[PDB]
Paper text:
REV7, also known as MAD2B and MAD2L2, is a conserved protein of the HORMA domain (named after the Hop1, REV7 and Mad2 proteins) family and undergoes an open (O)-to-closed (C) transition when partner proteins bind to the safety-belt.
To elucidate how shieldin complex is assembled, we constructed full length REV7 and the N-terminal REV7-binding domains of both SHLD3 and SHLD2 (designated as SHLD3(1-64) and SHLD2(1-52)), co-purified REV7-SHLD3(1-64)-SHLD2(1-52), and solved the crystal structure of the complex to 3.5 Å resolution. Unexpectedly, the crystal structure shows that SHLD3-SHLD2 binds two REV7 molecules, one in its closed (C) state and the other in an open (O) conformation, which are characterized by the conformation of the safety belt, thereafter we name it as C-REV7-O-REV7 conformational dimer. Our crystal structure demonstrates the structural basis of SHLD2 recognition by the SHLD3-O-REV7 complex. Thus, β1 and β2 of SHLD2 form a sandwich with β1 of SHLD3, while β1 of SHLD3 and β5 of O-REV7 form a sandwich with β1 of SHLD2, which are mainly connected by hydrogen bonds between backbones of β strands. Interestingly, the structural alignment also shows β1 of SHLD2 occupies the positon of RBM2 of SHLD3 in C-REV7-SHLD3 and the N-terminal region of SHLD3 displaces the safety belt of C-REV7.
Numbering used by the authors:
A (entry chain C): 2 to 60
B (entry chain A): 13 to 105, 115 to 209
C (entry chain B): 9 to 156, 183 to 211
D (entry chain D): 5 to 16, 33 to 52
The structure:
Amino acid sequence: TTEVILHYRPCESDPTQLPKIAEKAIQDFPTRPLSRFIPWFPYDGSKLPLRPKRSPPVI
Amino acid sequence: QVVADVLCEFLEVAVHLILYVREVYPVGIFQKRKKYNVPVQMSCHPELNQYIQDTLHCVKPLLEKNDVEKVVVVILDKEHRPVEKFVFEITQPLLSHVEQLLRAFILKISVCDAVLDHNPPGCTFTVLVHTREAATRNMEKIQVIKDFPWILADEQDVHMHDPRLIPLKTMTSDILKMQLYVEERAHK
Amino acid sequence: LNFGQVVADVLCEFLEVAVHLILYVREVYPVGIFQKRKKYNVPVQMSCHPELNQYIQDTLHCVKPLLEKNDVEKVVVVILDKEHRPVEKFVFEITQPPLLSISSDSLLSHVEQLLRAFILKISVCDAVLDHNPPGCTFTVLVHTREAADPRLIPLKTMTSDILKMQLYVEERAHKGS
Amino acid sequence: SQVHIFWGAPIAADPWKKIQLLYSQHSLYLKD
């Protein structure tokens, strides 16, 4: 069993209650599968985006 | 046009914020503003500001009708070549709800400078609107305001070399599905 | 100072950036407190709430000697919800080779690029992260190292190897209301 | 091998007080 060293501030009203509450943070929890990024609509090459004729002032 | 009204206000913020982050335009023009409860720098320049509002106004009819597939804010250099693309894939399937969902995107736009390679001096930007259907309907529909016309973009305009992907954020709401990623040219 | 302290010191600088960045991104704390600062010539979002900054600094002030002694397996940044249930954890694992052949000059130069490569892992990891329940907070775990023919003086290496820590994010299946 | 839990984060001399405890079976308890 592994040693824990809870660090807390003097401001805390309740030093005694920190262990049952921090008991929650140390607990491992059921992890969601690793979602990976994938573009919904990939670079197409046959579909052309609509570009406005006008151009920016670029002051 | 329940949803589409929100997207234009949102897109306008991103387009302005995007310029500030990539230093497309000198910083003198931009003015700090609180949009979406974030501090973002919008522009306070008239020639550019109308260009922006005019571009998105032309997109709403396609968003009201969900003719829009994605909207890409492209940064162009002196040679008018693509350097970075801010892709915004959009799929459309309580009012202050979504206004909180989108806020993630602003945050991730504002932190992209650390991760994107620095761009070349005197860059200029543009918008690409990829329609859902390649049909003519959208090409005549998109030109609401006259004196500001749209065209088709050639490969020269859209093709980028040695593109890299920097994902920014993905959300999957019941009312709006959206993705934001940046394609960056390896050599600039 | 010595190499060990300059390495340890740098590590924390990265960590200070990472915690601020993870707070900004995850919307743990309202964004207004954040102002952009440049660390190692990198635009890092940093905080302007002195209560929150002090908590982070003191924490790192206590981690730095544990690193100077290679006694850190990993440092975790648990985001907790209203009932102090972990919502997700950003695990930064430190791989500290016993040899430690590399000199500082190589390490000093690759510092900015390394910080940039760090931001990517954190910034590209949370893209796919869902939104956290409202009204959250965080803690920080640190786990001391479990276990341990040159006398000394291993050949010089100029690589950037094992001078970065890789974080694997864990997302709770059901984050909460 | 020990884990140092740092507490005290902003709401939704010596800098740190310390409590030393042990972890056994998904619960936290104080030292002997």
